[PDB]
């Protein structure tokens, strides 16, 4: 149960590593199907550097750009918002790619979700047409953001029994080797005395045998 059965955690584990590659995978396929995201993620790719560059150098961008840029880098885990800061992240050696690869499951429901929508999505100056005019770059982003936040909003009791079987058999075996001390220690005091009784038998053989000898002489 510890070498043949206990090994099941390697057989019943074929799920934690196999079926796991099915969890994230399954949501990935149906993620690139509901137009919404695709429709935008395709416009996020076709973005000239002529646009993303000028914005990077901009010192004080117009609100319609500030919001668009703040919302995107914010969803990437960047709780930051200060322009001076989010500016650098605009041309990081992974940012432009960190968009289309946005895991639609990292859309933190508590804040990230209810924030991007109540903090940008529904803003008088955060509309598709409005932003696009300020820059054809940060423009498609609101089309991607309104695709992520808007979309995502529409998406263990058997193995633990192995800890009850593996443990009951590991603990049980833990008392069987401790019981050996009950037989070896028991025999410990046995071998010491079983030996002494032998000392007498041997030593007595002399006194008794030697007497049959001496008695033979005295009698004669």
UniProtKB/Swiss-Prot annotation:
Record's subcellular location: Cytoplasm, Cytoskeleton
Region (Stalk) location: 1-220
Coiled-coil regions listed in the entry: 147-220
Entry similarity comment: Belongs to the dynein heavy chain family.
Subunit-level organization: Consists of at least two heavy chains and a number of intermediate and light chains.
Swiss-Prot/TrEMBL domain comment: Dynein heavy chains probably consist of an N-terminal stem (which binds cargo and interacts with other dynein components), and the head or motor domain. The motor contains six tandemly-linked AAA domains in the head, which form a ring. A stalk-like structure (formed by two of the coiled coil domains) protrudes between AAA 4 and AAA 5 and terminates in a microtubule-binding site. A seventh domain may also contribute to this ring; it is not clear whether the N-terminus or the C-terminus forms this extra domain.
Role summary: Cytoplasmic dynein acts as a motor for the intracellular retrograde motility of vesicles and organelles along microtubules. Dynein has ATPase activity; the force-producing power stroke is thought to occur on release of ADP.
Annotated protein name in UniProt: Dynein heavy chain, cytoplasmic
Record organism: Dictyostelium discoideum
Lineage of the organism: Eukaryota, Amoebozoa, Evosea, Eumycetozoa, Dictyostelia
Full-sequence range covered: 3337 to 3576 of 4730
